[PDB]
Design a protein around this ligand. Structure first.
Ligand code: HEM
Ligand SMILES: CN1CCC[C@H]1c1cccnc1
Length: 407
């Protein structure tokens, strides 16, 4: 339940929001979080849920905090406090100047250059999966495409066997949406337990895979340590297994419910890139933050050192003061504003890989199965957390309206 209110917190700023189980969850997870943006709610509130933590509710506040790493440190970036204290992935748990040097190395395995070179394989995997489903006329998109497409692309790049997916997927989820069987520390260590033997074997006999590059990598001329590689590889695992997988579900759900917007893409393919950006805004899904490094007065609110402050990357784009008709999906929006991939020194290094994956999915799915919808009488349940997702997305379509395309 609720944590006792700290001495310095004003009772008029208390809004008991629960990020792992928001009250208005059945209306759609993004809709649940938007309640923090209704007229009466202040720009910065305090929830007593999950141990108690501040919550910036507007883009202006969120963007500001992410830029000011001096007052807002990534050292303890997650809610609750035990999860953030135990979290030490690189570069996410570091602030500049220390974190900068590690980004370049990560870019060596997921940056635009590597992505450009993966295009052929990515499109090839997307098409096989889709054509594999096209004749059945149904599928549960979460397990049939959303998880396999991105995860297999990563497992491949990482030189990790596909049979290890179920185990790894489970562990990453305990970090973003814990079912209660594991603490944050336990899941993290279980992941490290998996990676350690591999980072050691890749440093003895390195291959060309992602982990080999990282384990034998150099940051600012000096060679990376075994511990650092572990912490960096753990972050890459989470990105390939619980980011795009969740996003594709939100996107296909919307498309399933809006024959209008899909038709807009089928008829005018060139706008798919722009459509992707708008879908990333409307269905943003990440929510992490920072921890106060000192007593600081922020927008009239007294914050004390050690206070945690959630800065939901998902809210900036939904903020009416940033986009005129927030909950409306308009592919022709002239200035699609958002912070879906973060803001500041920690801007997502995988976003380029993310976009190609989203764009390839839209182009290769719409080209084969243009007509489809939500299964008969199914009510789509969303899941909330550090990274929100879709519990299940069963779809259906008439095989006769589909077309077998050749890649
Ligand atoms: C649609 C999918 C994705 C979303 C929305 C997303 C979101 C984010 C966000 C918001 C951050 C910054 C968080 C913070 O400020 O603490 C971030 C960091 C990062 N992301 Fe992603 N990401 C996505 C996919 C990926 C993928 C697929 C990978 C790689 C396989 C990845 C790798 C990274 C890395 C390495 C960082 C750390 C950068 C740093 O610490 O400076 N992300 N991502
Ligand atoms: C805060 N991050 C942004 C993308 C993934 C997310 C995250 C979630 C769990 C563990 N590490 C990172």
């Amino acid at each position: 339940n609720l944590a006792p209110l700290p001495p310095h917190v004003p009772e008029h700023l208390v809004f008991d929001f629960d990020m792992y189980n928001p009250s208005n969850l059945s209306a759609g997870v993004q809709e649940a979080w938007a309640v923090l943006q209704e007229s009466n709610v202040p720009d910065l509130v305090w929830t007593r849920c999950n141990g108690g933590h501040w919550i910036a509710t507007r883009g202006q506040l969120i963007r500001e905090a992410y830029e000011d790493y001096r007052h807002f440190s990534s050292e303890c970036p997650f809610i609750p406090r035990e999860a953030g204290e135990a979290y030490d992935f690189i570069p996410t748990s570091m602030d500049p100047p220390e974190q900068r040097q590690f980004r370049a190395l990560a870019n060596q395995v997921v940056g635009m250059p590597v992505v450009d070179k993966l295009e052929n394989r990515i499109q090839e995997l997307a098409c096989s999966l889709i054509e594999s489903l096209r004749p059945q006329g149904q599928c549960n998109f979460t397990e049939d495409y959303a998880e396999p497409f991105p995860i297999r692309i990563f497992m491949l790049l990482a030189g990790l066997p596909e049979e290890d997916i179920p185990h790894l997927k489970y562990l990453t989820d305990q970090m973003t949406r814990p079912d209660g069987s594991m603490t944050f520390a336990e899941a993290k260590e279980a992941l490290y337990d998996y990676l350690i033997p591999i980072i050691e074997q890749r440093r003895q006999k390195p291959g060309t895979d992602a982990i080999s590059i990282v384990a034998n990598g150099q940051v600012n001329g000096r060679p990376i340590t075994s511990d650092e590689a572990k912490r960096m590889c753990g972050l890459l695992l989470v990105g390939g297994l619980d980011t795009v997988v969740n996003f594709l579900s939100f996107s296909m759900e919307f498309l399933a419910k809006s024959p209008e917007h899909r038709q807009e893409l089928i008829e005018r393919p060139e706008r798919i890139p722009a459509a992707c950006e708008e879908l990333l805004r409307r269905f943003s899904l990440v929510a992490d933050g920072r921890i106060l490094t000192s007593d600081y007065e922020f927008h009239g609110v007294q914050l004390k050192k050690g206070d945690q402050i959630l800065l939901p990357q998902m809210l900036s784009g939904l903020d009416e003061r940033e986009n005129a008709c927030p909950m409306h999906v308009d592919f022709s929006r002239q200035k699609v504003s958002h912070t879906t991939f973060g803001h500041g020194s920690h801007l997502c290094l995988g976003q380029h890989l993310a976009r190609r994956e989203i764009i390839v999915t839209l182009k290769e799915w719409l080209t084969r199965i243009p007509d489809f919808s939500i299964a008969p009488g199914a009510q789509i349940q969303h899941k909330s957390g550090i990274v929100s997702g879709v519990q299940a997305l069963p779809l259906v379509w008439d095989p006769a309206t589909t077309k077998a395309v050749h890649h």
